[PDB]
Amino acid sequence: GPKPPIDLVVTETTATSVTLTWDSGNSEPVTYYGIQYRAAGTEGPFQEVDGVATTRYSIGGLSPFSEYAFRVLAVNSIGRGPPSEAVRARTGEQAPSSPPRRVQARMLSASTMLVQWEPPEEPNGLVRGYRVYYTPDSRRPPNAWHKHNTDAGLLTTVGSLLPGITYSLRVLAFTAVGDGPPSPTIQVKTQ
């Protein structure tokens, strides 16, 4: 059985990938390596890429904005060796891939609307703000809707609305990378 690889280093990190380098940790030739890895908040077994013949490898398909642990093991003719010590990586951010949750809106006065929501289930990063889109005519293209930007707080008001009108509204979240998908459209009828 070979010895554990040593000097496992995370050398590069993106939103969906990590690049690793290590040294064989063995005097005799190692036939190939196994890389084991798993997400910080998962309960269960490491994931594995088998058959790696080099001492450099990039693991893709990872979830954004997620903390991972990686470790490497050696294989020779005798068998697989014990894994290296585990190293830490956190993947980078993307735009959210889900909407602000449970969007609701109501008139506080004849002209002021209160809008509120909860953070997206899949922010993929630190949410930097929201965008509330609203219009008196939902047939207009999205960029013809009025846009109201907010910070990462979970409520805002929109003022100076017109009376006796049905407004349509949707909300999206954004990270520093970009905008996520919008909530389903809701309607609010003004007095």
> CA–CA separation, 89 vs 160, rounded Å?
48
**Which domains, from first to last, does the chain contain?**
1-91 (no CATH), 92-191 (2.60.40.10)
Q: Which two tokens stand for residue 179?
A: 């905008």
Name the region of 77 (left: φ>0; alpha: ψ -120 to 50; beta: rest): alpha
Contacts of 109 (CB under 8 A, 6+ apart): none
Contacts of 143 (CB under 8 A, 6+ apart): none
State this model's resolution in angstroms: 1.8
> By the 8 A CB rule, do 67 and 90 touch?
yes
> CA–CA separation, 4 vs 25, rounded Å?
6
Neighbours of 96 (CB within 10 A): 26
Q: Which is it for the CA torsion 180, 158, 119, 137, positive or negative?
A: negative
Q: Which two tokens stand for residue 10?
A: 């995370």
> CA–CA separation, 94 vs 65, rounded Å?
8
Q: How far is CA 27 from CA 49, 54, 86, in A?
A: 23, 16, 21
Q: Which of 109, 132, 117 is nearest to 179 (CA)?
A: 132
